Design a protein around this motif. Structure first.
Motif, mmCIF file in Angstrom:
data_model
loop_
_atom_site.group_PDB
_atom_site.id
_atom_site.type_symbol
_atom_site.label_atom_id
_atom_site.label_comp_id
_atom_site.label_asym_id
_atom_site.label_seq_id
_atom_site.Cartn_x
_atom_site.Cartn_y
_atom_site.Cartn_z
ATOM 1 N N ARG A 163 3.582 14.232 -1.128
ATOM 2 C CA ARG A 163 2.179 13.900 -1.425
ATOM 3 C C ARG A 163 1.820 12.666 -0.632
ATOM 4 O O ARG A 163 2.700 11.844 -0.356
ATOM 5 N N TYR A 164 0.557 12.519 -0.235
ATOM 6 C CA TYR A 164 0.148 11.379 0.565
ATOM 7 C C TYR A 164 -1.017 10.671 -0.066
ATOM 8 O O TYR A 164 -1.887 11.296 -0.675
ATOM 9 N N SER A 165 -1.132 9.392 0.215
ATOM 10 C CA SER A 165 -2.303 8.605 -0.132
ATOM 11 C C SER A 165 -3.461 9.124 0.744
ATOM 12 O O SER A 165 -3.263 9.472 1.910
ATOM 13 N N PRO A 166 -4.680 9.147 0.215
ATOM 14 C CA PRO A 166 -5.828 9.586 1.037
ATOM 15 C C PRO A 166 -5.991 8.783 2.338
ATOM 16 O O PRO A 166 -6.431 9.335 3.330
ATOM 17 N N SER A 167 -5.583 7.520 2.361
ATOM 18 C CA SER A 167 -5.660 6.698 3.575
ATOM 19 C C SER A 167 -4.609 7.058 4.621
ATOM 20 O O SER A 167 -4.726 6.613 5.755
ATOM 21 N N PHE A 168 -3.575 7.821 4.257
ATOM 22 C CA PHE A 168 -2.513 8.171 5.178
ATOM 23 C C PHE A 168 -2.367 9.680 5.438
ATOM 24 O O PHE A 168 -1.646 10.061 6.341
ATOM 25 N N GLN A 169 -3.043 10.535 4.668
ATOM 26 C CA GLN A 169 -2.988 11.983 4.856
ATOM 27 C C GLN A 169 -3.465 12.354 6.275
ATOM 28 O O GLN A 169 -4.527 11.901 6.695
ATOM 29 N N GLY A 170 -2.648 13.097 7.020
ATOM 30 C CA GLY A 170 -3.006 13.460 8.387
ATOM 31 C C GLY A 170 -2.634 12.407 9.418
ATOM 32 O O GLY A 170 -2.705 12.680 10.616
ATOM 33 N N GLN A 171 -2.244 11.198 8.991
ATOM 34 C CA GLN A 171 -1.862 10.130 9.920
ATOM 35 C C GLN A 171 -0.356 10.010 10.083
ATOM 36 O O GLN A 171 0.107 9.544 11.115
ATOM 37 N N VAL A 172 0.403 10.358 9.046
ATOM 38 C CA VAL A 172 1.866 10.291 9.059
ATOM 39 C C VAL A 172 2.427 11.573 8.425
ATOM 40 O O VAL A 172 1.719 12.305 7.698
ATOM 41 N N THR A 173 3.713 11.838 8.686
ATOM 42 C CA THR A 173 4.413 12.951 8.089
ATOM 43 C C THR A 173 5.671 12.386 7.475
ATOM 44 O O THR A 173 6.381 11.584 8.103
ATOM 45 N N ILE A 174 5.917 12.755 6.232
ATOM 46 C CA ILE A 174 7.105 12.347 5.522
ATOM 47 C C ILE A 174 8.002 13.575 5.439
ATOM 48 O O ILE A 174 7.516 14.657 5.138
ATOM 49 N N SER A 175 9.296 13.421 5.699
ATOM 50 C CA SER A 175 10.229 14.529 5.634
ATOM 51 C C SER A 175 11.593 14.052 5.137
ATOM 52 O O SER A 175 11.790 12.862 4.941
ATOM 53 N N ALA A 176 12.512 14.976 4.886
ATOM 54 C CA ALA A 176 13.836 14.633 4.415
ATOM 55 C C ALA A 176 14.860 15.640 4.899
ATOM 56 O O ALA A 176 14.567 16.818 5.065
ATOM 57 N N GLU A 198 0.858 -1.189 0.000
ATOM 58 C CA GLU A 198 0.000 0.000 0.000
ATOM 59 C C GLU A 198 0.878 1.217 0.000
ATOM 60 O O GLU A 198 1.730 1.338 0.884
ATOM 61 N N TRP A 199 0.666 2.129 -0.934
ATOM 62 C CA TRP A 199 1.443 3.354 -0.984
ATOM 63 C C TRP A 199 1.009 4.300 0.155
ATOM 64 O O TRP A 199 -0.179 4.442 0.406
ATOM 65 N N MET A 200 1.959 4.899 0.859
ATOM 66 C CA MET A 200 1.638 5.825 1.948
ATOM 67 C C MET A 200 1.812 7.248 1.446
ATOM 68 O O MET A 200 0.939 8.091 1.615
ATOM 69 N N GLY A 201 2.945 7.506 0.809
ATOM 70 C CA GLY A 201 3.209 8.813 0.249
ATOM 71 C C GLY A 201 4.595 8.935 -0.312
ATOM 72 O O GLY A 201 5.350 7.970 -0.338
ATOM 73 N N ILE A 202 4.926 10.125 -0.786
ATOM 74 C CA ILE A 202 6.220 10.364 -1.424
ATOM 75 C C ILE A 202 6.884 11.656 -0.920
ATOM 76 O O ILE A 202 6.244 12.515 -0.298
ATOM 77 N N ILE A 203 8.151 11.843 -1.310
ATOM 78 C CA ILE A 203 8.887 13.050 -1.062
ATOM 79 C C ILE A 203 9.962 13.206 -2.114
ATOM 80 O O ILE A 203 10.557 12.219 -2.542
ATOM 81 N N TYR A 204 10.205 14.444 -2.542
ATOM 82 C CA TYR A 204 11.309 14.779 -3.434
ATOM 83 C C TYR A 204 12.305 15.457 -2.523
ATOM 84 O O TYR A 204 12.136 16.618 -2.191
ATOM 85 N N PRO A 205 13.326 14.728 -2.045
ATOM 86 C CA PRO A 205 14.263 15.307 -1.069
ATOM 87 C C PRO A 205 14.937 16.628 -1.423
ATOM 88 O O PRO A 205 15.279 17.382 -0.514
ATOM 89 N N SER A 206 15.089 16.929 -2.714
ATOM 90 C CA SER A 206 15.694 18.190 -3.125
ATOM 91 C C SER A 206 14.917 19.426 -2.612
ATOM 92 O O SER A 206 15.532 20.400 -2.192
ATOM 93 N N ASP A 207 13.582 19.376 -2.633
ATOM 94 C CA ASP A 207 12.769 20.507 -2.214
ATOM 95 C C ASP A 207 11.702 20.167 -1.140
ATOM 96 O O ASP A 207 10.850 21.010 -0.833
ATOM 97 N N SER A 208 11.726 18.939 -0.617
ATOM 98 C CA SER A 208 10.767 18.406 0.354
ATOM 99 C C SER A 208 9.302 18.445 -0.112
ATOM 100 O O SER A 208 8.395 18.461 0.735
ATOM 101 N N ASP A 209 9.049 18.376 -1.437
ATOM 102 C CA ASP A 209 7.672 18.304 -1.938
ATOM 103 C C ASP A 209 7.121 16.935 -1.500
ATOM 104 O O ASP A 209 7.788 15.934 -1.712
#
Lengths: 214, 101, 214, 94, 219, 213
Positions: E59-72, E46-57
Motif C-alpha cells: 500500500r502507498y501513501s497518496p503522496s508516493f503512489q506512482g512515484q516509488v515501487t516497494i517490493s520484497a 513521512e510514511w511512503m508505503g508498506i509491504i507484507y513480505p509473505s505475499d508482497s501486498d
C-alpha cells in the motif's frame, strides 16, 4: 425468527432406490445445518453436520448438500436399516431449530388384509364390559378403513385402533380395532360385524358373528 | 511432523462486543485439563444487525467469525504422552453480512 | 466414553413437581452447551431450551418459557429440567443433548420418559381372543393396566412367527389396553397348546393364559 | 517440559466491515501458517452499498497459543507462546 | 539479534533509477510488515508505503503512489524501495521499519541517505564574510567564511588551526539547486580583537583532497 | 483519512521539570497508538505502544495515557538526554501514521539575535553569482522571520536558511540566511537589507549595506 420445512412428509421407496430428502429454511442459515436419523425407541443420531460433513461412523451412502436456504440429504442406495424418521436442524439462530421430520417407508406390492373377528370372552362379560376385536392382518399400503356394525347400525365414537410398525420380513402392516360396549348394550344386539375397506380388496370385506353362536 | 515432541510450558481488551452492529456475548469455555484452560467464545446477540437508529435490521445478518486454534488436552493417566495437540474452531466475535457483495 | 446419562423414567400425578437430570462424563461439561428436547408419543422433536453450564446462561423456547426451569450444577457435571406443577400434556420422552457453540447436537442422552396421569398402578386382566379357512388367528386382549409397559410372549418365546403385538391404546378411563395376536395353521388348533405370557412389572403381575377354541 | 502427541466462508467479503487475509508464515512456529486479517476500509458499507464514514471497521483480535522451536530449528522441542491474531473485522458505532 | 540492515548511502544523478534494500534477520521476515518512511533534512517523518513480505501486498501513501515501487524477496529476507527517475527533491534519509499487524514500528533500520545531484566530486571555493566598522553589534564584530560549491559532503571547518573555538558557529550545509553544497562558518569576536590578531578559516574537503586556508580581514 | 496533530509544536522545559506532550487524532484510533523519541541524525526509538505500554528498556519516567482521540505522553522528571523530537503514531488505519512531531527543547529566557550582514566578496563577484549573507547570532526562541529587501523590494525564492542545534552552553540558536543573486541582478541594485523579526525585538531590525561602499 427462522423456520425449517421438510419435504415430503412421508417418502415411500424400495431398498436399493435413491432417497432425496428436502429441508428449506425461511431465510439463510449459512451452513449451520445438521441431519439426524431416528429409529423407534431410540434417540436421534447425528448423520451430517455443517450441511455436508458426515459424522464419524456414518456410512458413505449418506450425503448432505446445500447452503443458505436449500438443503438436501441423499441416501444413494437404501439399506433396510435406513427406513426411519429424518430431521433437519439449524444451529444458526434460535429461532426454531428443528424441521418437522420426514418418515421413510418401504414400498412393496399391494397386499389385502386377512380379516378376523373375535367376540368378547365369557370371563370379560362377567365383569360388566364387552370388547369386540377385529384384526386386519399383513396388508400394504397402511391406509385401511374399519367400520363396526351392530345389527346393521354403523357405530361411531366407541372404538379404538392400533397399528404395528412395518414388518421386518414382509414390509406389511397389521391393525386391531376394538369396539367397547357395556354388558347391557352388548346383550341387546345380535349381529356384530367389522367391515374393512382396503386398496387390495375389490369390494369391502365383512367378518361377523351372532352373539351366543359358537 | 514428529509424533512426540517436548514442550516447555513456561511462557516467556476492548468493548467491540458491545458497540458492534453485530454485537455478541462472551462465554467462558473452561476445561481444567486443557491449555489454555479458558477460551472466550462468542455468540451473536441478534439475527439481524443494529442500524443507525438502534433498531435491529433484518435485511442484514450477524454471523460469528470462527478461528482455528491449537489446544493441549491432558492425556489419560499414564499415557506415553502427558498431552495431545488438537485443533478446534472458536467463534471470536461477530460481523454483519449483507445479502450480496 | 463421552456420554450423557439421564435420570430414570418417572410416573407422576397432575400437580406434582419433578426435577429430571442429565449428567455428562468423558468430556468438559463447561466447554459445551446442553439442550433439552421434548418428544410427545409418535410426534417430532421440540426444543425446550438451552444452558451453558460454565456460566449458567439459559434460554427457553417461547413455547416453554414460564412452564419449566432449566439449571445446571457444574461441580457435578449435571444439567436439570424441572416442573413446579405437572400436567397430563407433559407425558413425553425428554432428551438432553450436548452441542458446542455453533455446532450440532453430537451427544445425546438416552431420554427420560415422563408419564403424567391421575391413574394409579393396576395390573391387567388378560382375556382370550379365541380361534374360529386357510390360516387361523388367535390372541390375548391385555386390558386395563397402568402404567406402560406390558410384555407379551407366546409359548414362553418358542412361538415368534406370525406374532403381532400391537402398541397399547390409552382408554378414556386412563388405563391402557393392547392385543397380541398370532396366525397359526388351523390343523394345529386341537394339537398344539397356545399360551400368551403377559408380564406387567409395575404391578408385579404375571399371567399365562391358555387360548383355545371356544 | 512435557511430552505432547502432535496428532469455509466468504464472510471476509460479504461483511459490512470486510477484510483481507494475509499468510503469516514462520518456519520456527507450530502452526507455521496463521491467517491474519486486516480491515479493508476505515468505514462500514451501508444498506446502499457505499462506505459510511460514520461507522468504523475494527479488527477482532484473539489471543492464541503457538509452539516456538527451542532451541531454534529443533524438530522435537518447543516452548509454548501466546500471540495476538486479528481474525476478522466488525463494524462499531462511535 | 532482531534487526533491519539497510543498504549504504547513495549519490545519484537526476533521471537515474535507484533500488535501496532493507534486510531483516533474527526474526520471521514473513510474519511482519515493513514500512518505508522518508525524512527530508530537518523535517518530520513521512510514511511512503508498506509491504507484507509473505505475499508482497503493498500500500502507498497518496503522496508516493506512482512515484516509488516497494517490493520484497522473501527468500533473502529483503524489502526494497525503488525510483524509476530520481529528482533533487528525493534527497532525504529513508528508513525501513518492522511492524506486526495492528502494531507499532518496533524495529528500525539505520536509514539510507539518498542524495540526488548532477555534480561530480568538486572542492569548495572559500570566500570571506568580512567584519565591517559599519556592521558591528555594540562592542562585538562578526566574521566568517562562505564555503561554496563543493561535492559531496562533508567539509570540516576550523578557525586559526583549532586555536579559536569560542563563538564559532558552523552551519549545516544546504544542497543548492545547482547540485553543489554550500555552508557558512562564522565567529563573533570583540571589536577590540580585530587589529590585534588574524582570523583564518581552515577548510578541508577530504573527498577532493582539498585544503584551503582563507584569511578574513576588514575590507 | 486519519490525521494526528501534536501539541505544542515546541515544548520548552528545564531538566527536572515534568513534560506533558499531547496527540489528538481526527477520529478515533482506539488504543492503536505509539510514541517515539528521535534525536538528530538517529532513527526513531519506540517509547510507548498501545497508548500506555512502555517498550523494553524505556525508563519508568516515561508514561503514556489516553484512548480514542486524545493521548498524552508524560516524562515525570526530565533528564538531559530527554531533549529531543517526539512523535505520536497511529496504526489503526492509514490514513497517516505520524503526527508532525513536538520538539522538546531546553528552556531559557528570550534573547534577541545580534544581526550581521555580509556583502559578496570581490573574489565571488568574478563568477556569475553573488551571495549575500545575513547572520542571526545567539537568539531564543528559534522562531524568527528573515526577509531580504533589494532596493526595498521583497525577495522571494532566492534565499536559503540554515540553523544550528540548540547551543550546549547557553541554549540559544544561530541562523544564517543566504541570498543568491546572479551577478547581473546584484549590479542592477544598490541597497541590500536583511530584516529580522523576533520576539526579543520590539520592532524589526534591519542590517543593510550599499553596494560598492
Amino acid at each position: 425468527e427462522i423456520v425449517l420445512t421438510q419435504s415430503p412428509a412421508t417418502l415411500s421407496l424400495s431398498p436399493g432406490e435413491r432417497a432425496t430428502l428436502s429441508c428449506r429454511a425461511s431465510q439463510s442459515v449459512f451452513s449451520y445445518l445438521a441431519w439426524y436419523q431416528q429409529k423407534p425407541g431410540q434417540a436421534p443420531r447425528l448423520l451430517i453436520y455443517d450441511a455436508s460433513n458426515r459424522a464419524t461412523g456414518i456410512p458413505a451412502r449418506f450425503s448432505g448438500s446445500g447452503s443458505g436456504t436449500d438443503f438436501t440429504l441423499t441416501i444413494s442406495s437404501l439399506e433396510p436399516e435406513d427406513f426411519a424418521v429424518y430431521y433437519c436442524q439449524q444451529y444458526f439462530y434460535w429461532g426454531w431449530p428443528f424441521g418437522q421430520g420426514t418418515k421413510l417407508e418401504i414400498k412393496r406390492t399391494v397386499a389385502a388384509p386377512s380379516v378376523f373377528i373375535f367376540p368378547p370372552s365369557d370371563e370379560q362379560l362377567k365383569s360388566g364390559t364387552a370388547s369386540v376385536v377385529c384384526l386386519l392382518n399383513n396388508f400394504y399400503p397402511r391406509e385401511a378403513k374399519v367400520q363396526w356394525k351392530v345389527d346393521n347400525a354403523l357405530q361411531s365414537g366407541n372404538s379404538q385402533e392400533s397399528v404395528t410398525e412395518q414388518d421386518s420380513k414382509d414390509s406389511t402392516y397389521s391393525l386391531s380395532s376394538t369396539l367397547t360396549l357395556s354388558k347391557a348394550d352388548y346383550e341387546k344386539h345380535k349381529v356384530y360385524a367389522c367391515e374393512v375397506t382396503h386398496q387390495g380388496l375389490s369390494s369391502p370385506v365383512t367378518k361377523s358373528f351372532n352373539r351366543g353362536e359358537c | 511432523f514428529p509424533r512426540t515432541v517436548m514442550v516447555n510450558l513456561n511462557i516467556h481488551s476492548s468493548d467491540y462486543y458491545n458497540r458492534s452492529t453485530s454485537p455478541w456475548n462472551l462465554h467462558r469455555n473452561e476445561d481444567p485439563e486443557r491449555y489454555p484452560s479458558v477460551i472466550w467464545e462468542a455468540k451473536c446477540r441478534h439475527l439481524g444487525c443494529i442500524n443507525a437508529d438502534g433498531n435491529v435490521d433484518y435485511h442484514m445478518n450477524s454471523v460469528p467469525i470462527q478461528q482455528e486454534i491449537l489446544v493441549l488436552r491432558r492425556e489419560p493417566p499414564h499415557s506415553p504422552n502427558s498431552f495431545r495437540l488438537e485443533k478446534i474452531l472458536v467463534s471470536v466475535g461477530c460481523t454483519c453480512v449483507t445479502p450480496i457483495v | 466414553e463421552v456420554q450423557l446419562v439421564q435420570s430414570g423414567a418417572e410416573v407422576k400425578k397432575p400437580g406434582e413437581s419433578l426435577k429430571i437430570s442429565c449428567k455428562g462424563s468423558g468430556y468438559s461439561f463447561t466447554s459445551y452447551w446442553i439442550g433439552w428436547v421434548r418428544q410427545m408419543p409418535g410426534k417430532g422433536l421440540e426444543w425446550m431450551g438451552i444452558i451453558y453450564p460454565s456460566d449458567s446462561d439459559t434460554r427457553y423456547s417461547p413455547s416453554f418459557q414460564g412452564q419449566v426451569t432449566i439449571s445446571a450444577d457444574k461441580s457435578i457435571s449435571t444439567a436439570y429440567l424441572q416442573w413446579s406443577s405437572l400436567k397430563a400434556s407433559d407425558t413425553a420422552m425428554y432428551y438432553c443433548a450436548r452441542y458446542p457453540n455453533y455446532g450440532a447436537f453430537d451427544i445425546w442422552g438416552q431420554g427420560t420418559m415422563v408419564t403424567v396421569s391421575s391413574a394409579s398402578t393396576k395390573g391387567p386382566s388378560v382375556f382370550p381372543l379365541a380361534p374360529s379357512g386357510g390360516t387361523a388367528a388367535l390372541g390375548c386382549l391385555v386390558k386395563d393396566y397402568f402404567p406402560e409397559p406390558v410384555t407379551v410372549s407366546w409359548n414362553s418365546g418358542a412361538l415368534t412367527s406370525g406374532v403381532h403385538t400391537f402398541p397399547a391404546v390409552l382408554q378414556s378411563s386412563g388405563l391402557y389396553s393392547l392385543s397380541s395376536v398370532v396366525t397359526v395353521p388351523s390343523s394345529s388348533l386341537g394339537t398344539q397348546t397356545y399360551i400368551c405370557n403377559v408380564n406387567h412389572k409395575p404391578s408385579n403381575t404375571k399371567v399365562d393364559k391358555k387360548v383355545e377354541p371356544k
